[PDB]
Amino acid sequence: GPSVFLFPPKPKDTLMISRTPEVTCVVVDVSHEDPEVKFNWYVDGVEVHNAKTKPREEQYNSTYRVVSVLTVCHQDWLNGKEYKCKVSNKALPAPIEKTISKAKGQPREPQVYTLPPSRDELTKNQVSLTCLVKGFYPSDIAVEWESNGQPENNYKTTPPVLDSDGSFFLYSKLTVDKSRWQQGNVFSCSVMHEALHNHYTQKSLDKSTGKPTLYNVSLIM
Amino acid sequence: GPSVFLFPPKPKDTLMISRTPEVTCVVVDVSHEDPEVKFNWYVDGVEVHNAKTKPREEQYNSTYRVVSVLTVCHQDWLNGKEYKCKVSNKALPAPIEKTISKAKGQPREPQVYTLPPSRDELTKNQVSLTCLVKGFYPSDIAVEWESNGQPENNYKTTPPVLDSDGSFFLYSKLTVDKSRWQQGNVFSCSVMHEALHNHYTQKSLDKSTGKPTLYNVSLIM
Amino acid sequence: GPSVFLFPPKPKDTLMISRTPEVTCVVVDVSHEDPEVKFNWYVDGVEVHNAKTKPREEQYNSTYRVVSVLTVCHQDWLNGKEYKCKVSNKALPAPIEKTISKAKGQPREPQVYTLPPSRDELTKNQVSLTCLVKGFYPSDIAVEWESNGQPENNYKTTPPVLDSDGSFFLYSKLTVDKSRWQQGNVFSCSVMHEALHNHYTQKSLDKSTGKPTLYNVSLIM
Ligand SMILES: *[C@@H]1O[C@H](CO)[C@@H](O)[C@H](O)[C@H]1NC(C)=O
Ligand SMILES: *[C@@H]1O[C@H](CO)[C@@H](O)[C@H](O)[C@H]1NC(C)=O
Ligand SMILES: *[C@@H]1O[C@H](CO)[C@@H](O)[C@H](O)[C@H]1NC(C)=O
């Protein structure tokens, strides 16, 4: 019958209280002869009926795609609860199940450092801001830029990369224009990792004197 | 017959991911003729079975006390979903039902400040550290002190007090010995309020009353 | 069967000469059949005819209530003179005598330390100062605020909180226009308590009480 996948929740959703995390069981390549799609979610051997069933979606190759969204709770996912998606279908001869949980590795606290642009790139119209996040295990991590408490969109982030000690490390290149950088604006890097206390951290990068790299102080003594 | 209370979960438990939030409903004044009690837990009317009942405690007034604890979800409680501990017992002509939820309102974020001890304080055996938490809403915060990631215990916190502009504020004195203070220990105060980003903030305090304020700024370049 | 309540004066009144401490005796449950009441007092067994009685009041319970007020010189209350409230009511099988005097406990002098506001608040248009009080027994104390001999009213005080050593401690944040604090206006926190010398003390504040005078500045490069 139709293939059934599994989607883990975004680690940013799982590590943030304000965000709702979801465990997703998607079905792909479903024919029109079998529109009946059923799910049975078992958490640690306990069936849960709280799942929400999204509408089916038709692709260009005339296949349905029914999305099974289950609202997961952060304490559950972080503590090691197994989530079983038992789907019984007409086109499937037998029920299909897939097991998903969290990575049961040894947590390692990320170290976050922010680096100002070097003077080489101070000639262009847009400077690059670097957020080094090294020494964290595992790769379930997310990073974004915030300026004066509001989100920043013009940035990218390299995927985590294996290191010498077996941990991971990744970067985040924030492209702001030269003027806003040169006004002394405060840019902050936000990193959410399971090993971090409160699953959050922040580093600030001022223009001249907050981080001493170029020095000119009107000291108030 | 018996009577039923309702304990909201601690704000420290609710606003911290690693902690376990729970709604405790307490039944006291239970006679010997009806010692067995049934707990039906509802979250917006939906029954749950994950509540862990507790052994009876025989009170000195010739009665019992049986308590059932439901571990709530952080998203569920902090959103404002209702919680009803329905207690069924033979003695009660009508089973007791009470409902508790998060205090609805406009959550104004706190503005944490920290105040180093006055100069007159450093002439005593122990100093006191002030962590002002002003202008928040509502009055559900637990404040704890930390030192280099270690917990602090010798501190007290004033109950939240009203503020002229309708908000709240509160205080916390950290009693530490003067010697550790005078070395240059990095003491920090930890707040957890629902209106913050990640519902957590930490304010640093060190020997200097700010960088350009105290005895000398030994510039090293 | 009337009941004779008795209430001490507010401690703020008793500690300070200008305000008037008073003996507030209440006769409650005064039936309408025998509503006429006679008031008597003893000062260590001596009748005094210098008191005044507030007029009769009506309540929602179809009963009567009266309150009488006797002027007390602060010395008599301070050294524990005995005040007894006698009521000669016609609905009484016997006169009721209630004895009130100074609530004698051990005294410990409050140690008033005032703390300047932190620079983090200095960005706001309002600034909150602090007058910590600690190590005093018992918890009956009034803290006021003044500047240039003129009292301020934009202040709030937290209720006393028990300390580790059995004493108490409390705080008093007062908010001012930032500019008013910026020219180094003085701000004295008055503390009135029995254990203090003269039942009164004060500690001042100034833009330069957090900014010292010694500056051993060093430039090592
Ligand atoms: C340093 O900053 C001061 C701020 O008053 C400014 O006037 C001065 O030109 C600056 N000097 C530099 C950038 O060399
Ligand atoms: C000034 O700073 C230096 C840094 O080397 C320190 O040794 C010295 O004690 C400071 N001065 C005072 C008066 O504390
Ligand atoms: C002031 O700083 C100088 C330079 O470091 C040092 O030699 C001197 O002892 C300091 N004065 C003090 C600590 O009183």
Swiss-Prot record, chains A, B, C:
Boundaries of every Ig-like domain copy: 2-101, 110-205
Region described as Constant (C) domain: spans on this chain: 1-205
UniProt-annotated glycosylation sites, renumbered to this chain: N61
Subcellular localization: Secreted; Cell membrane
Quaternary state and interactors: Immunoglobulins are composed of two identical heavy chains and two identical light chains; disulfide-linked.
Function: Immunoglobulins, also known as antibodies, are membrane-bound or secreted glycoproteins produced by B lymphocytes. In the recognition phase of humoral immunity, the membrane-bound immunoglobulins serve as receptors which, upon binding of a specific antigen, trigger the clonal expansion and differentiation of B lymphocytes into immunoglobulins-secreting plasma cells. Secreted immunoglobulins mediate the effector phase of humoral immunity, which results in the elimination of bound antigens.
UniProt-recorded name of the protein: Immunoglobulin gamma-1 heavy chain
Coverage span on the entire protein: 239 to 443 of 449
